[PDB]
């Protein structure tokens with residue numbers, strides 16, 4: 001029986017609460033949550049701001065798919081039906097650690113082959129051994145930029161009481177060009193501005209006024225949970241609610257001790273759960289997106305993207321207080337979040353070495369102009385020959401573009417200094433994302449404006465003081481600063497092939513990623529006959545389909 005109430009959100013059930021180590025213990029509900037998702041391709045689709053898009057790719061006929069709802073401890077089973085015309089697809093459950101279920105991670109070329117179009121299907125099955133807000137999206141090149149996105153809401157305890165859960169609130173850049181058109185563009189030009197920003201799938205057009213603002217209703221006097229998600233392909237957002245603060249209670253899938261802020265930076269793929277108290281004069285208030293960092297991590301052709309938060313009982317119409325711009329967040333996420341379930345990372349004798357350093361670089365000396373590399377190699381996988389097929393067939397002859405980084409030893413700690421192109425003339429902020437794990441942010445280069453051109457190259461002597469293992473930020477996306485660095489660590493507790501990549505679609509398309517091959521021998525030993533059978537069958541189906549495809553693979557595949 002549940003003990004989770006508005007006044008006691010910390011409690012879940014007997015023996016299970018906000019302090020439970022959810023990486024060890026989850027309720028055994030015995031419950032399965034089956035879902036079916038169907039992808040379709042639509043030409044000349046009238047979008048939410050009135051502009052007709054040449055082509056979109058939708059989950060259940062929307063550019064935001066159905067939300068995957070579950071409770072902590074449930075089993076989730078998602079049948080994905082690919083009714084696109086030519087593209088394969090693979091659906092990644094972003095933020096779900098897939099503990100012991102690597103082959104359900106949905107990373108084509110890594111953990112599976114793509115699902116063939118015109119009716120291909122597969123069933124993903126995984127456990128809700130975490131709770132909080134996540135999202136799902138295609139990993140088939142930049143396909144999710146066409147609309148193959150949705151939210152995940154796994155209910156469980158929380159670090160603050162609240163009366164009402166308002167639900168998921170995904171915010172996304174929106175382009176009139178297709179994802180494939182934008183990959184082609186960004187091979188030889190920088191990232192463009194978004195045409196608009198959609199809040200829960202809607203917005204007004206900045207010139208015509210067609211469309212509608214998202215409209216979120218607050219109950220006067222009450223505390224409301226809002227589940228923010230940046231589902232963009234490139235835009236990084238600063239969000240703020242006029243005349244209201246937001247109290248953070250979770251970052252990505254990790255509950256944190258409450259932190260009240262006036263505005264919030266959401267990198268691509270980041271989530272924040274916040275509590276908003278409706279304690280102001282009843283009215284209508286803008287929920288604004290703004291951009292900082294010299295627009296180096298996004299801008300939009302809509303100068304004032306916004307939603308409306310409406311107090312129940314107040315008048316209708318638009319807010320009248322335009323509010324003030326928030327502080328410039330410098331394309332940086334919060335460095336001081338504190339997980340409720342605290343952990344210490346050993347930091348005794350850490351030093352920079354070839355085997356714990358990964359340099360992100362941009363190579364502009366060839367064709368295409370923008371080639372992204374990690375440790376000197378642009379990632380490039382073969383959709384028909386996924387990493388885990390090499391592991392299972394005991395083939396160690398990975399192509400160089402697979403960017404395999406071996407991580408061995410059960411329960412080892414794996415440390416990584418990520419450097420942003422030391423010495424380069426121009427660098428960009430990067431939202432770095434690890435599959436299969438939360439990582440720990442041990443430190444990063446001093447906060448700067450990314451437009452300041454102030455360089456920081458990690459100096460092991462000088463910069464040890466910037467590193468700490470005392471309950472570090474723990475999450476699954478964090479920012480690599482322009483002209484700087486970040487040190488990350490994770491525990492080798494999950495045998496699998498795990499992508500680690502920049503979540504800007506143009507960058508991972510263009511080569512910015514590696515594959516952590518974690519405990520490969522253990523992975524081979526743990527993969528069930530059923531998982532191996534399903535891998536092999538889908539890969540056979542994909543390989544039979546691929547030569548009939550009218551289009552080439554245009555990029556890394558990721």
Ligand SMILES: *[C@@H]1O[C@H](CO)[C@@H](O[C@@H]2O[C@H](CO)[C@@H](O[C@@H]3O[C@H](CO)[C@@H](O)[C@H](O[C@H]4O[C@H](CO)[C@@H](O)[C@H](O)[C@@H]4O[C@H]4O[C@H](CO)[C@@H](O)[C@H](O)[C@@H]4O[C@H]4O[C@H](CO)[C@@H](O)[C@H](O)[C@@H]4O)[C@@H]3O)[C@H](O)[C@H]2NC(C)=O)[C@H](O)[C@H]1NC(C)=O
Nearest residue numbers: 002003004005006067155164165166167168169200215216
């Ligand atoms: C963006 O657009 C999307 C799409 O239109 C919007 O999605 C909607 O989001 C709603 C909020 O998540 C969601 O409502 C939920 O729907 C499901 C039905 O499938 C239902 O389970 C939920 O019902 C709960 O919440 C309502 C209040 O809304 C309660 O009246 C109700 O009794 C349920 O309360 C229980 O669950 C809550 C968490 O969901 C708890 O906060 C609550 O305390 C209570 O939990 C206790 O009881 C449980 C059972 O006894 C127990 O397990 C637990 O431990 C506790 O003891 C709710 O109605 C819509 O379904 C969803 N619509 C779609 C189409 O997806 C979204 O809102 C938009 N975003 C914004 C910001 O506007």
Ligand SMILES: *[C@@H]1O[C@H](CO)[C@@H](O[C@@H]2O[C@H](CO)[C@@H](O[C@@H]3O[C@H](CO[C@H]4O[C@H](CO)[C@@H](O)[C@H](O[C@H]5O[C@H](CO)[C@@H](O)[C@H](O)[C@@H]5O)[C@@H]4O)[C@@H](O)[C@H](O)[C@@H]3O)[C@H](O)[C@H]2NC(C)=O)[C@H](O)[C@H]1NC(C)=O
Nearest residue numbers: 034035036037038039059060061065066067068079081121
């Ligand atoms: C996302 O969208 C999909 C649709 O694209 C939703 O799934 C559909 O759900 C509706 C109900 O909401 C169903 O509509 C009914 O269909 C009845 C006939 O169903 C049989 O025939 C279908 C056509 O051949 C066939 O697809 C279907 O198979 C499905 O269910 C079987 C039973 O579990 C299973 O063997 C298959 O895996 C397959 O999933 C049946 O054999 C009809 O009599 C009713 O009048 C009504 O129209 C659809 O059948 C569903 N389609 C599919 C493919 O599942 C899905 O719920 C949406 N998801 C969310 C989260 O909203």
Ligand SMILES: *[C@@H]1O[C@H](CO)[C@@H](O[C@@H]2O[C@H](CO)[C@@H](O[C@@H]3O[C@H](CO)[C@@H](O)[C@H](O)[C@@H]3O)[C@H](O)[C@H]2NC(C)=O)[C@H](O)[C@H]1NC(C)=O
Nearest residue numbers: 212213214215216217308310311312313314315316317318
């Ligand atoms: C956002 O959604 C809310 C619903 O949650 C809308 O609020 C509703 O707004 C209408 C007016 O647009 C209110 O009705 C009005 O009431 C007055 C007095 O009773 C009456 O004189 C008017 O003729 C009209 O009927 C309604 O009360 C209100 N509902 C709630 C629960 O507050 C709001 O309009 C939406 N905003 C936008 C921009 O769409």
Ligand SMILES: *[C@@H]1O[C@H](CO)[C@@H](O[C@@H]2O[C@H](CO)[C@@H](O[C@@H]3O[C@H](CO)[C@@H](O)[C@H](O)[C@@H]3O)[C@H](O)[C@H]2NC(C)=O)[C@H](O)[C@H]1NC(C)=O
Nearest residue numbers: 286287288289290304305306318319321322323324325326
């Ligand atoms: C939060 O979002 C809202 C909604 O987009 C922003 O409101 C907009 O603010 C701009 C800037 O002042 C307004 O433009 C001005 O319009 C007037 C009237 O046409 C004109 O005289 C000025 O020269 C200027 O163009 C705009 O009208 C207004 N939009 C709406 C619908 O009211 C708000 O500024 C945002 N706040 C923050 C802090 O970003």
Ligand SMILES: *[C@@H]1O[C@H](CO)[C@@H](O[C@@H]2O[C@H](CO)[C@@H](O)[C@H](O)[C@H]2NC(C)=O)[C@H](O)[C@H]1NC(C)=O
Nearest residue numbers: 055086087088178179180181549551552553554
């Ligand atoms: C996935 O489907 C899209 C949409 O049809 C394909 O996109 C086209 O790709 C060609 C070749 O690069 C371009 O000339 C077109 O401009 C693209 N069209 C649109 C609307 O974007 C894409 O090639 C497909 N990918 C695969 C691997 O099949």
Ligand SMILES: *[C@@H]1O[C@H](CO)[C@@H](O)[C@H](O)[C@H]1NC(C)=O
Nearest residue numbers: 354355356357375376404405
């Ligand atoms: C970086 O690449 C070199 C080969 O160019 C390789 O020897 C080294 O092991 C790589 N480092 C990592 C961490 O993968």
Ligand SMILES: *[C@@H]1O[C@H](CO)[C@@H](O)[C@H](O)[C@H]1NC(C)=O
Nearest residue numbers: 385390393395396397398399
């Ligand atoms: C192992 O992989 C390499 C590279 O993809 C391939 O050329 C070779 O044929 C594979 N070996 C076997 C036995 O399949």
Ligand SMILES: [Ca+2]
Nearest residue numbers: 362363364424
């Ligand atoms: Ca260079």
Ligand SMILES: [Ca+2]
Nearest residue numbers: 529530532533
């Ligand atoms: Ca078999």
Ligand SMILES: [Cu+2]
Nearest residue numbers: 094137269503
């Ligand atoms: Cu993701």
Ligand SMILES: [Cu+2]
Nearest residue numbers: 094095434435
């Ligand atoms: Cu992910």
Ligand SMILES: [Cu+2]
Nearest residue numbers: 430502504507
């Ligand atoms: Cu990047």
Ligand SMILES: [Cu+2]
Nearest residue numbers: 092435499501
């Ligand atoms: Cu990914």
Ligand SMILES: [O-]
Nearest residue numbers: 092094433503
């Ligand atoms: O991802």
